[PDB]
Amino acid sequence: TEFLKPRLVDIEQVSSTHAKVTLEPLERGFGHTLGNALRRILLSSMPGCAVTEVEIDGVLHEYSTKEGVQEDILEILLNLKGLAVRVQGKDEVILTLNKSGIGPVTAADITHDGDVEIVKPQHVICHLTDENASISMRIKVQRGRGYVPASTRIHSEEDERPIGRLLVDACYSPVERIAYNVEAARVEQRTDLDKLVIEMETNGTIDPEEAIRRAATILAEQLEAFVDLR
Amino acid sequence: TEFLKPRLVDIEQVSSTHAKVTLEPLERGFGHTLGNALRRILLSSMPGCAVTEVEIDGVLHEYSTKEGVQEDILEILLNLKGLAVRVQGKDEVILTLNKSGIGPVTAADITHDGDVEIVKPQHVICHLTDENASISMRIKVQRGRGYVPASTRIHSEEDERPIGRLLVDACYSPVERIAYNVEAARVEQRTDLDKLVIEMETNGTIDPEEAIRRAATILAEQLEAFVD
Amino acid sequence: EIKELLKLGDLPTSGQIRLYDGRTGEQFERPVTVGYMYMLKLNHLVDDKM
Amino acid sequence: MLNTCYRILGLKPTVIFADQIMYTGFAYAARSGASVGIDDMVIPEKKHEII
Amino acid sequence: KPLVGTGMERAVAVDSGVTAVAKRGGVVQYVDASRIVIKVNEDEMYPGEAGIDIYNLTKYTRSNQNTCINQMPCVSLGEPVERGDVLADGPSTDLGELALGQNMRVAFMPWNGYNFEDSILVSERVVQEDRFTTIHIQELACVSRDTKLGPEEITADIPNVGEAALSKLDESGIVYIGAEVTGGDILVGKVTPKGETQLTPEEKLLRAIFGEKASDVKDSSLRVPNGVSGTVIDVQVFTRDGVEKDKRA
Amino acid sequence: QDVVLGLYYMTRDCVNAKGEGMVLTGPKEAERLYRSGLASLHARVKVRIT
Amino acid sequence: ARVTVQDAVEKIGNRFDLVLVAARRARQMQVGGKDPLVPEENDKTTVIALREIEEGLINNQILDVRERQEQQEQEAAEL
Incomplete structure (x- = not known):
């Protein structure tokens, strides 16, 4: 296990409705893993x-x-x-x-x-x-x-x-449109390791950073059942 | 928020290398969210x-x-x-x-x-x-x-x-083949629910159940950066 | 003329875009014809027919 | 394939085989993203010559 | 509107007669959902009359196929209008152009056989936007006739009825305007005379057990058709010259 | 309709493609390299099948 | 037996005599209240009758044997 966790780098808020959130570094394949799984919770499950x-x-x-x-x-x-x-x-x-x-x-x-x-x-x-x-x-x-x-x-x-x-x-649901992308990370010497740009386009109320935080919380609460109960 | 968590029901362990796992009742639209997201980690990222x-x-x-x-x-x-x-x-x-x-x-x-x-x-x-x-x-x-x-x-x-x-x-990755299916879960009032049904294929070194457990652990470890 | 108009909107000549499966997230194997077709709801509705 | 399978194996195998063919057939059709564009209708360059 | 038209859309919408068009050009004096009042320019305005055209727009009304007909004003308060311009859009028209349906992002690709034989896969978002949602205005008549035994009444006094049915009816026995109704619910309370019918001993027992014995006048109330359900938008009453009028009428 | 087209697209081969002339343990490792994204469905490959 | 009735047909022969035998046994469990030989497994009397034919428990000849046994036992209690 070479566990390599990403961290929230930058939140480019172009407008209060539309904001990009960059995420790095992600180990190979985790970019699309979290990307889609989050997009789904951000579309349908957001209060x-x-x-x-x-x-x-x-x-x-x-x-x-x-x-x-x-x-x-x-x-x-x-x-x-x-x-x-x-x-x-x-x-x-x-x-x-x-x-x-x-x-x-x-x-x-x-x-x-x-x-x-x-x-x-x-x-x-x-x-x-x-x-x-x-x-x-x-x-x-x-x-x-x-x-x-x-x-x-x-x-x-x-x-x-x-x-x-x-x-x-x-x-x-406050999220109107959402689409994650993938870009170069250019960290220390990881090279392969890249980042994940989650572009969100919402109404006014729910704040971009706040919304992603809630969506990751909902996914972790579903994972309690797969960690705890075997 | 009407959070409805599934729970591990029956683990039909046909052999030590092939075992079926049934999950219910999961909330509608989370049937394929965890099914695919897990399939991906289990195919490419498993040790x-x-x-x-x-x-x-x-x-x-x-x-x-x-x-x-x-x-x-x-x-x-x-x-x-x-x-x-x-x-x-x-x-x-x-x-x-x-x-x-x-x-x-x-x-x-x-x-x-x-x-x-x-x-x-x-x-x-x-x-x-x-x-x-x-x-x-x-x-x-x-x-x-x-x-x-x-x-x-x-x-x-x-x-x-x-x-x-x-x-x-x-x-x-001990996992040779892995497949997840979802059809339709019927409950009391909800009728648009789904029941994740994946058939992971291992070799014997790692238990099917264990492999799944590790993949969910890696996913929760990534959620440490998103605080909640 | 249509392909020329597509260039005005910075869209492909082909009128086929790389789509991605909503369920999985991975791409479909080829560009898919996507665009805006004016569709119509006919009077044969199923609440009446059933 | 189903006629071969019917005469070799029986009824049960064909019903399961026919289904499994259906399922995978639809699924991989969707994966392909096969489509229909105006450029897909290639006309030979030598049509005006023939006419 | 259609994004990919021919240009005949505006010819069809206007000539069809469903769109309210300006007989004479000028400035719109008064705008409203119900009507449009336009003042005319001196050159086209006639010297006799004031020269103010009135267009009382035909509002959410029934069609022959039980579909909707509404005329919405498509010009703003105090707008300069040219003669022969469309002042109000019809049920299937938009800024003068014909609008039979809706245009949408379509992708040609197969999908798990859910588009097998011309089967269509539509997003929830189209259903959510209520854009393909259709209005169906529906006409149901309640008639008091004259049988051999006597004339039929229209009162809230109906034998064999729960308070759930009489709840949406008023004193006269007619449902309120705006009241939502579903299959079974009585729209207009109608009761009919019945001869003193031979009650079978078992029925006579059961009527004597509860006490509520069927009266001389039975029942034939207009109720919402089985399965259909909507909101009452209007009720219209036609009483014959000389017969008792309801208080609702 | 789609079913024929799908098995057709699956079985049909293509020049090199991703991962040509590889060698696989079974039909399950073929699904493994396809879903892992290291081989096209059209790659000429030696496979052990029983 | 659940979907596929081929194994039940292979045991008798005729598709038509199969419906006649299965119905006879279905009607015994429906009215007479006979106990099933195969575990019920929460299926309808129709499927139990097919299952029993598939395994080789119910048959036109076997049903006549068992009908004669119940019939003639009661005839002997009379005589």
Whole structure:
């Protein structure tokens, strides 16, 4: 056993969404071993927060039309799925949005909770055309992982059935795109030994370094069973 | 987080060299994550011992022909690649093989070292046809892990390469073949789960179960850099 | 004209790219034709047909 | 191959053999990454000559 | 839109009549999901009237194949518009161009025989984006007729019913607009007269055991078809001239 | 369809390729050098088969 | 017996008389409640009947022997 462990070298954060992470030195073949196994956990298993429920006033269903609003309610729900939200303390927060007058309703119009950060405040949700028009809604953000559709969520719970509650497809996973590469390491005299560049392209909330840390933790927790129980 | 860990169920150990392993219930999408990631480490990165060098007397190179011997020297080297060896203490041992008369030269003809076990003694290495004929060789077994061929060694090592030293492909990782399958796991509510089912193929020096255990240990050692 | 347009986007003449298996991570043995085809969902849906 | 196998071995072996052929056949087809491009349709240089 | 069109897309979308087009060019005075009001330029505007065109856009409505028809405004608040431009996009159109489906990254290669005979392997991401998700508006009618024995009622008062079924109905016996429903659930409570039917002794026992004996009026309520399930987007009531009107009506 | 094409691609040989004229212990060591990435499926090789 | 019914056919001969024999034995375990000879191994009465034919336990002639044994024993208790 010539155990040679890699170490986190450099995190080239080009943007808050897109960041490269270089990794060296890796012994031959471990570059692709961790590369893919991590990519899989980073795609599907990464916990995140996502808009689960919405409840707009003057709205009985998502297919209706609201006066003084360019977008149909479905297109508003779409914008709320891609609303970047980070809940710090609790798993479930129900934010309130009341806004009026002529203006594109941005994410900053939502009343921020003590422990809730709206990561992109300039994110568009709805367009108010008429000055007389006012919009009011209650946006529930819950935490989960992966992607939970509204068609899978309308066939499980349904204990309380309040008429006026629109469910939304949850985009819980924060990682949008991920693709690991391999480059020259140029260490001491290892030569063969190289590195592993993990390029991540995420939303706002989950931080590149933090996310890779969590993904390696999930893989190590699955490996407990193969180390401990034989 | 609804973390659902699998646990080792039944280890169908058909032989000491072939054993089946059933895993359940694993979380959906982790069926092929660990199955392949392990397959890779078990193929190329596993440690074990293998014939690296041989040196037969009356032989200047591997292409020559020795009188009173059925197999060409290349076909003898092939038999030494598949010679199962376990070195207990040292990482490098040079075994001596001298034998004569009419007989299939088996692995038991090699002089066993204080700390060297030849695992299949009935393993054929060469056939002596003539009784007057006698074979002598010096077989170097080194340790490593995974599979290092002679092509990936002549390219890397450009150090001592003298004429007559016969280079043989080393099969150190005791694992000969390894395959993982996943179909579909049915549970209570989850129906998109999977049950990893790999059929690792070893030689006998290392236990199938042990090999898996080491490969998961190497993977956890890499996770030490990622803190959690 | 299509190959000329592919060079404007810094894409191959061939319109075939080296893809990699999502499951394993290793490459497929050859370049695979990839691109954007406008597809259509027909009315023959299985919820009605079953 | 399956006609040979049917007459030598029997029914059981052919059913398993036919399956195993199917499995490995699909798998290695996918490995190959065989594809269809416009350059794969080679026209002979001497077509306009023949016409 | 299609990335690889022919150019006939815009001819087809516009001539089909499904897209709301500008009769006269000018500046858009008022924009809304429901309607578009455009003020016309003096040169094309007629001297008599005010010269403000109104386009009340046809909204999420049923088709003959029970599919969706919606007109979305494709011009912004107070935008200068030329005559004969597309003010609002149809169900299968985008900025005037015809949009029958969606374009996507396709790789031609075999895959474990999951694309065996024209079998298609699609990513979860396409299903996740709900881009190939289709709307199916569905029309089910509840009719009170006149049988020999008497006229049929439409009330929430229905024999043999759990509170789960009557929960989404209102006082009149009609489901609320917006209420999600699944196969079995009653949409409109309809009850029909029945003669005093010969109850078999076993049935007469069981009705005398619980006490709830079947009334003169039986049951024929409109309920959601077996397996189908959606959200109620509208209810329309047609009462004959002289017959009792429900409070919902 | 794919099944024929796959066994066809497997069996068919090619000039040298990766690892030509090698010598293997069994059909399992052939899968070992292919999955290890040291030999193409089309390499001419001597193999011991029973 | 599970997938392949060739070994059961090789023991009787006719594919048709096999279905008739297997059904006769299936109906004994279904109604009469006879105990199976091969371990059940959690299979349906149909598969047990094939398994027993495959091994050479159930047969048209053997079933007539065992039917005559149960029948005539009761006929002897009468007479």
